[PDB]
């Protein structure tokens, strides 16, 4: 299977079928998003708009998930029942959260087949995030009154952010229901997001898993780890760009400030996760709306128990949103420990050396002695290489599930990431 023999058929037999399949599977979702956007411009009553997006969400859920969408429908009905029963309370967040938790647990306890649950994990995660965020917004006082049935439904079934789309606050969805003019900035954002989504899709499917033997003349257990990591990262970037494309096509995802309308919904940042500065930056820039949801709700609610327990329960809730499945809770707990130890070691070195080696670039007001130079840049490059190593190790699980499979993968990778994290923690203990 010579390199030239691979490339002679690469273009056609990989770039055309995968792009064509992406288009054939997302064209109807894009059409329905555009139809809802155009229909929310005629100036119908608000409840008509919410009913329209409810019907659009029903049709989209049916198209993607053939008939197993009854689980998402029952999750929405149950979330509304729990929000209505506790509409006058101040605990709405914890009530909706316990309801969501019990639902996901009873689901994973063989309420539905493993394949269909793996298929609908994303839709149910978005519905759960939306319901819990609305509960906590009503609790804290950032949303005035509880929504009517049709408003709550049209929020959960927003045709833009139902299948792929990110979590958007209830007020973002309300502003979307208001609608904004179909300017040239809007179409520019939608077209650019679709182009980047298709580019990242074809990269993840064609160039990712086949770059180290062919695209680079270099070549192994770590080269394949980096290949799989990059393939999964670019698949997720495709999903993110497509999600923001649909959320901007439906109308949502804008920030109107000072009567200046910028369609600036960003879901992922590929240049911050591929060329990282620190694992905290990777976790932040991987999924930006999901990071905002997690940080804000879970972390601000549980910070009272100390920062370490707060981030631990943050990652626990992150693994629970997905539904308890191995290779997705082990990875997330390893991420918790890695980011914690890395940020702590960065703070300790930036204290003992007063240098600019923090986990995030220092603001201009910091009294650090080494703002620039060679030591700071070399140490930042070292920590970036460690972050790339951790990312490749963790993403090796996505070679192109079973606990035995994960232990096998990490054992054939010799557990080097956990050893490195433990060594960094011991080093922090010895320094401080």
């Amino acid at each position: 299977f010579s390199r030239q023999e691979f490339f002679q058929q690469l273009l056609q037999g990989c770039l055309l079928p995968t792009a064509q399949q992406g288009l054939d599977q997302i064209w109807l979702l894009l059409a329905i998003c555009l139809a809802c956007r155009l229909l929310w411009r005629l100036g119908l009553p608000s409840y008509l708009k919410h009913a329209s997006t409810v019907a659009g969400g029903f049709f989209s859920l049916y198209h993607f998930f053939q008939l197993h969408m009854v689980w998402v429908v029952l999750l929405s009905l149950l979330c509304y029942l729990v929000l209505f029963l506790c509409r006058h309370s101040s605990h709405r967040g914890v009530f909706l959260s316990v309801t969501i938790l019990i639902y996901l647990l009873m689901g994973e306890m063989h309420m539905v087949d493993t394949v269909t649950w793996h298929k609908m994990r994303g839709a149910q995660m978005i519905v759960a995030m939306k319901a819990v965020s609305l509960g906590f917004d009503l609790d804290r006082g950032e949303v005035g009154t509880v929504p009517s049935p049709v408003e709550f439904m049209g929020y959960l079934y927003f045709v833009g952010t139902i299948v792929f789309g990110p979590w958007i606050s209830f007020h973002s969805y309300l502003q979307a229901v208001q609608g904004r003019p179909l300017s040239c900035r809007w179409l520019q954002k939608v077209a650019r997001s679709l182009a980047l989504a298709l580019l990242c899709l074809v990269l993840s499917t064609c160039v990712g898993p086949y770059l180290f033997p062919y695209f680079i003349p270099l070549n192994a257990r770590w080269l394949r780890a980096y290949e799989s990591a990059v393939s999964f990262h670019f698949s997720n970037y495709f999903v993110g760009f497509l999600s923001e494309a649909t959320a901007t096509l439906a109308g949502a995802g804008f920030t109107e400030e000072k009567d200046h309308l910028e369609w600036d919904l960003t879901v992922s940042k590929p240049l911050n996760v591929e060329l990282p500065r620190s694992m905290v930056e990777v976790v932040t820039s991987w999924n930006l709306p999901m990071s905002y949801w997690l940080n804000n709700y879970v972390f601000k609610n549980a910070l009272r128990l100390g920062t370490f327990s707060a981030v631990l329960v943050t990652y626990a809730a992150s693994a629970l949103l997905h539904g308890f499945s191995f290779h997705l809770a082990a990875v997330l707990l390893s991420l918790a420990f890695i980011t914690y130890v890395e940020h702590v070691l960065r703070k300790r070195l930036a204290r003992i050396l007063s240098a600019c080696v923090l986990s995030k670039r220092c603001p201009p007001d910091c009294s650090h002695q080494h703002r620039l130079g060679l030591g700071v840049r070399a140490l930042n490059l070292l920590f970036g290489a460690l972050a790339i190593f951790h990312l490749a190790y963790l993403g090796s699980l996505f070679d192109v599930y079973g606990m035995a499979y994960t232990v096998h993968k990490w054992s054939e990778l010799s557990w080097a990431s956990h050893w490195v994290t433990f060594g960094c923690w011991i080093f922090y203990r010895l320094i401080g």
Epitope: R87, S90, H91, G144
Partner: antibody, heavy 119, light 107 residues
Framework: EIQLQQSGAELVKPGASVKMSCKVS????????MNWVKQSHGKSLEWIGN????????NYNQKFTGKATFTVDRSSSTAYMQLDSLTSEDSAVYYC????????????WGQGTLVTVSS | DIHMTQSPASLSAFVGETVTITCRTS??????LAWYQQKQGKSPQLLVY???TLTSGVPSRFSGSGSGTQFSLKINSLQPEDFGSYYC?????????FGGGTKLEIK
Amino acid sequence: EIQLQQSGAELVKPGASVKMSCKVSGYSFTGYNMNWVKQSHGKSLEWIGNINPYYVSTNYNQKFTGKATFTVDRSSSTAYMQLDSLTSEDSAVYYCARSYGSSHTFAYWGQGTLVTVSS
Amino acid sequence: DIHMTQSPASLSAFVGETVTITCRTSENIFSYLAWYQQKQGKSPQLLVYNAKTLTSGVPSRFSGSGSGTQFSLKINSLQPEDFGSYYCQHHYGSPYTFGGGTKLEIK
């Protein structure tokens, strides 16, 4: 028969600090937000913020951040507000207002604590 | 944030007359607008919430209406205990801002 009994009047020198109290009575104190409302002498009402008594998480108006601090004491079921570095413009009446359940309207109000600053 | 322009700033009427107070909003609030009534010296009192829904105890002579950015409160058959100050307040989302106020006086 909900009754949000509030503290007495106050007369402090500028730059000092005051800590009002709104002793609640009539319902489960930790089940409804406690909106704090400021009204000048014959002017419009202004919303300072609200403290959620279940988990103590405040939400301040951007104008009154740093100028107001909400603390609650669920043992005696009284909500407090502190004013830091009082200026001559804070001679107003401050109400405590319970949020009307689902909506965030102010169903039950206190009676007001006349705060006046002078020398 | 959201600004609540309320007119008129003052209003005189008789006993049994019909009056209407308007509260125009600088943004869309989806009919989230409450109406209070502060008498001379007392604390305010919620009369109408959700711009249409009366509360428990307020008589039937009050009736809120409107939606979007132009709301109104119509008080028919003014009784002597209907005279005070009326402050419209949106409950769309934090921060909550009240209106200017309408001093309803007898004459």
